[PDB]
Design a protein around this ligand. Structure first.
Ligand SMILES: [K+]
Ligand SMILES: [K+]
Ligand SMILES: [Mg+2]
Ligand SMILES: [Mg+2]
Ligand SMILES: [Mg+2]
Ligand SMILES: [Mg+2]
Ligand SMILES: [Mg+2]
Ligand SMILES: [Mg+2]
Ligand SMILES: [Mg+2]
Ligand SMILES: [Mg+2]
Ligand SMILES: [Mg+2]
Ligand SMILES: [Mg+2]
Lengths: 740, 740
């Protein structure tokens, strides 16, 4: 029945660990505030602050524009949720029997329609705040990482990493806390109807991933229109340094790192956290924990997260205080040791939590039957997910870091042109999918066998128990991107840019690694949500060999490709506008190409703003309308196949897009760095080889930064949407099969 | 119930229609031999036949080397079949209970292990023969297409199309006649055990696709290494023309067209035909047709194929006689009309066949249950697949022909370089999969609903009911591509090359449509085989939400990407060697660029021959070993997942690769033609736009001619293989689930 750790204990521990998380985050922002600068060498400090202000102004300006739209959609959609969910029992206010225990009476479905809408609003608002806070810290840390670079890599590393850790700890504690609050608040109303309490809390992950979808796509098109434009004309055509202040797209480019790579990624990861936690919660609510009203075991996923924070705080110190970087070859293994330490520390942490938060025996809902599960079996569920991440990390690294042969052979293929560079890169990413799929598959088999959907939901959360650390090394990247962006823009020494370029390359690998973690955990959470949807829809069997299910499967597998076609073409078209505008300024503003005259940055901000804001609508629509269109016309059996098909298919293309993109970026950085005979013999910057790498890198730009990373939101989003609307689809769905 | 057509009337009709087709082929070959030439204006006539022979020698050279390896593998594999299938019943020689009716007695399992092996070898040999024959007629008419180009486009077209029709009718009429002989020879032994007759006959399909796998990959690696290397040093670096006899890779390049695009393509479609016929047969054999021993209706697939030949013969006469081409703008429509005509006649053809060769009611095996099916519903099954092919073709043409916006917009994007070209192309291909997947899915729903697995199989055959026309227009492409390369190597007038390039661009679109049909029917056949596998393996339900099935599903979905990574990196590495070699000759043989000295052609053929033969092995291994590894270690449930996932996932990347690839080619052709204001504004040849387009085209080379077209084989092979080994798997597989 009960576990060692009493209910009230859990009620204290959880928000305590959140608060500690926010305290840590603020203490770090404080230490970062020690690096001083203003716009009132002395000049080089002033030039940094004026550039940093351009970016900060530019990124706050876009997010307000984007969130204004997204926020309107969020309201429209909350109405739908209410209407559709309320329409099931014809908006009755009368209680009915608990579908999980006919002897008992539950709160009316109308209530759950209402609280669903509230938890959705919470989830979406929290997702937006995650993006916004992430940008605010990144637009603050960027130039301070520039100034500290004067003292060498190791000092710049610290302000970039301390800052990344600001975002990670803020995001993780805030999401943990909101969920915690929402639960207790709702419980005031639901009392003993824990089934309906947690059914309403599922809106939270729906809100999270909904807003994230637009955040990622909008911020993604914005930033990559800029990037591909600046780089092509600036580097391939006009033969000037990357991020040169003469280049009119340079401000949009660096703003982009903050509205895409940081704000978009911030929200994306919030959704991953929200859904996984919520998937664990719903399965539990109709399992022995929820049925016996055992709060501690019921909140087991929240306790794992609480301990994850503490664990991640301790891990952070190893990079923050117990180790100084002195050479550039030490930067990555620092970042990589962050992963290894937290994984190892969390394993202990999780065994402890498994030991004191669970009863040694209990039951997990398994498609209508209470399965007998043991607490050590549950430990292995979260542990197999946790370690699957680390594996994915190691392998992604091997495939995206220019310290290894795969990428160096990609760089080396530039010797015969761009075409070979592109062929090697594509082949690289395809190859990269293999071990992660295997890690995902193993992870699924173990956790599925032990505790059905709950095991899988808990595996996903295992993969994100170290989410604070994971976020820091991820947010470290774009900060190091801006930092060398400001260095070049402020005409600082070549020795500064050399350091930032080592940081930036390190952030390239961790960018792909975090992408791997998002794909992996999104496959786990999707599979949990899918299987939960099936029960909720009163489906008896998802049988691949029925006509309804199979058409669902093959069409669902096509969706990720449809989505990719849209996002790619969007960037490809906006980048074409950027290139024309950049050329126009170079060819018609006298004095520009010789640094005597100033470029018009605002036009490039205006081109990327107009395209991202407009073009984030159709792919947002495909993802959000699909569950609804399919659920209503074809019904829940066809929807089942669609959920399965987009998972097994989306995952393949997300992984290879992100890795191919990463491999091209770092292949380029390798040539740029000339830190070996081989690398030098490919250089120098401007050579035919370097220009092949730049082409490859720019094709990879929208792959790894718009399509690739958003595809994991597609997969995990369609599953919560389906699970949430399942009562409506079960009852009013499959019209086409009814009219005929 | 029996049909209006008597069994004897069917035993006659089939080989008669075969022989007609074989006659019509022999006729067309002779008519083409009217064009006279030999290696003994007229100065140019002897330079052509000098080149043709260099091509024919080297093509025949490679196929022998390739087939040596393939035949060995074939003999080895035929043993595994005997051994595995033999060990089901412990190698007993006594009869046993029928697998589809315990109340009845069948022929011994060991007898079927033998006939399975005999049919496999039949299929393997008929497959290699299909590739080799196609190579002959191709390497025979290529120079004859060059020479006839001196008298307008419309008269070079004819010899090309006739010669294509030679290969079409030979391959269709022969694969049918070998199957018909095998069925009748086998019937002698099996007597009333029709169930075991057609169970053994399925090895035919396994034979074809097995040997087509290696032909495509090996013949596709060979050809593209050459293609990419030649084009890059030639057109991008040294600014010399495409197919310039100074370029030492032009021979391997033009040999490659016959060795890959012709030989590898003929085996591919044979395997498609064979599997579709067989799948129709194995289901029918345990349905009322085979149970009641009704030979005519039993042989319904072979009857449709027969009428198909006649229809195609009629249809072929339209483009080869009573309709002539004047404008180069008439070529594509002439080919496109071939499809429309044959589809329309064939719809009348199948109506007739359905009317006189079926009973009006019968039963179709439907997972252990005889399902009531009406003749007119079977009519719709083959019809839907027939029309879905036509739909697939038209959509393919829209995204691949430079007569429409998608490809024209892709050419446009060259104005901003190779990077935007590639981004636009990738996005086009992705975009291009939507409608074809909808077509396939609609076929699957309609056919599955009417007649279960039988319908699906009969739909696949419906999509290949006009295989001779389809093969005719498809084989026409590589004949034309060769024809222009001989013109350029003979040094003939540029009046000529603009005619051949018209042919060649038409052939380019055609090749993509061929690719669509192949994938479309592969998807359908794979589903039928998959469904037949499930019954044979005694699986009650393929339930998605079970661990064994899901890991099967996600890992299976990863497979076509693994395969891709191999085939891509292979071409990429061989192309890198090619470029270095061409560079070496140009930089070390004096007078070579000047046209005084002669290049070492034999070295380029040697780089290709080495790469392909060595590198076809692993992708082959992956496809053949997967059913065995999963079937043996994991069991039929998991192998069910792998079959579902690889179909569903593989089809997407198959379609998008072939289309992206075809699009980049035709965009480059658009610019090299200069037949419009827009076109001319991107030229001339040599420009930065033309060069960016060539970058795109050579990246697309391996996507559309190595990976893409082969991926469709991966799907239909793994399915039929699994079906053949089903009894062995069901009995002796699933080991890791038995040890633990
Ligand atoms: K990065
Ligand atoms: K062709
Ligand atoms: Mg860039
Ligand atoms: Mg950037
Ligand atoms: Mg950057
Ligand atoms: Mg970067
Ligand atoms: Mg970039
Ligand atoms: Mg070529
Ligand atoms: Mg060719
Ligand atoms: Mg050619
Ligand atoms: Mg061609
Ligand atoms: Mg080519």
């Amino acid at each position: 029945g009960a576990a060692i750790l009493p209910d009230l204990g859990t009620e204290i521990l959880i928000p305590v660990c959140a608060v500690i998380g926010i305290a840590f985050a603020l203490f770090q922002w404080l230490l970062v505030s020690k690096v001083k600068l203003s716009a009132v060498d002395h000049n080089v400090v002033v030039k940094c602050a004026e550039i940093q202000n351009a970016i900060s102004e530019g990124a706050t300006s876009f997010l307000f524009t984007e969130y204004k739209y997204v926020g309107i959609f969020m309201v429209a959609f909350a109405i739908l949720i209410f209407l559709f969910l309320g329409s099931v029992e014809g908006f009755s206010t009368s209680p009915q029997a608990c579908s999980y225990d006919k002897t008992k009476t539950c709160k009316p479905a109308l209530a759950t329609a209402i609280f669903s809408t509230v938890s959705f609003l919470l989830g979406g608002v929290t997702s937006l705040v995650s993006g916004f806070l992430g940008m605010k810290i990144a637009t603050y840390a960027n130039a301070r990482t520039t100034l500290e670079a004067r003292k060498g890599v190791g000092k710049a590393f610290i302000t970039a990493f301390r800052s990344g850790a600001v975002m990670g700890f803020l995001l993780a504690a805030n999401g943990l806390l909101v969920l915690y609050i929402a639960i207790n608040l709702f419980k005031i109303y639901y009392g003993d109807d824990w089934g309906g309490l947690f059914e309403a809390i599922t809106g939270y992950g729906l809100g999270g991933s909904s807003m994230a979808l637009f955040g990622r796509v909008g911020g993604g098109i914005y930033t990559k229109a800029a990037d591909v434009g600046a780089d092509l004309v600036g580097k391939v055509e006009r033969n000037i340094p990357e991020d040169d202040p003469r280049n009119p797209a340079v401000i949009a480019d660096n703003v982009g790192d903050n509205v895409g790579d940081i704000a978009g990624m911030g929200s994306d990861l919030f959704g991953s956290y929200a859904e996984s936690s919520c998937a664990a919660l719903v399965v539990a609510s109709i399992s022995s924990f929820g049925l016996n009203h055992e709060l501690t075991a019921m909140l087991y996923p929240l306790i794992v997260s609480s301990v994850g924070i503490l664990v991640c705080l301790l891990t952070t110190l190893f990079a923050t205080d117990f180790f100084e970087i002195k050479a550039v070859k030490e930067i990555e293994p620092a970042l990589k040791k962050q992963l290894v330490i937290s994984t190892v520390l969390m394993t202990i942490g999780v065994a402890v939590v498994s030991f004191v938060a669970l009863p040694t025996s209990f039951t997990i809902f398994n498609f209508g039957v209470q399965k007998d599960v043991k607490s050590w079996q549950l430990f292995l569920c979260v542990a197999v997910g946790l370690w699957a991440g680390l594996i994915i990390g190691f392998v992604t690294e091997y495939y995206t870091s220019n310290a290894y042969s795969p990428v160096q052979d990609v760089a080396d293929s530039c010797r015969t042109g761009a075409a070979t560079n592109v062929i090697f890169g594509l082949a690289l990413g395809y190859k990269s999918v293999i071990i992660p799929i295997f890690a995902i598959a193993i992870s699924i088999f173990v956790s599925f066998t032990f505790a059905a959907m709950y095991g899988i939901a808990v595996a996903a959360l295992g993969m994100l128990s170290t989410i604070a650390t994971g976020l820091a090394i991820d947010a470290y990247g774009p900060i190091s991107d801006n930092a060398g962006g400001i260095a070049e823009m402020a005409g600082m020494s070549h020795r500064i840019r050399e350091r930032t370029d080592a940081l930036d390359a390190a952030g390239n690998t961790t960018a792909a690694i975090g992408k791997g973690f998002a794909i992996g955990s999104a496959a786990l959470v999707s599979l949990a949500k899918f299987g939960a949807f099936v029960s909720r829809a009163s489906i008896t069997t998802v049988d691949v060999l029925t006509p309804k299910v199979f058409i669902g499967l093959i069409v669902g597998a096509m969706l990720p490709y449809w989505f990719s076609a849209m996002t790619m073409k969007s960037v490809g078209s906006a980048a074409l506008k950027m290139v024309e505008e950049v050329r126009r300024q170079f060819n018609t503003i006298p004095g520009l190409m010789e640094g005597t005259a100033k470029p018009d940055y605002a036009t490039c901000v205006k081109i990327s703003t107009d395209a991202s804001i407009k073009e984030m609508i159709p792919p947002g629509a495909l993802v959000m309308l699909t569950p609804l269109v399919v659920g209503i016309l074809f019904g829940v059996e066809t929807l089942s196949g669609v959920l399965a098909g987009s998972l097994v298919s989306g995952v393949q293309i997300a992984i290879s897009a992100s890795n191919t993109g990463g491999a091209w970026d770092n292949a380029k950085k390798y040539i740029e760095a000339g830190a070996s005979e081989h690398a030098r013999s490919l250089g120098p910057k401007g050579s035919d080889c370097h220009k092949a790498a730049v082409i490859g890198d720019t094709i990879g730009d929208p792959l790894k930064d718009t399509s690739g990373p958003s595809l994991n939101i597609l997969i995990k989003l369609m599953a919560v949407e389906s699970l949430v609307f399942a009562p409506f689809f079960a009852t009013h769905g499959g019209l086409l099969f009814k009219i005929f």
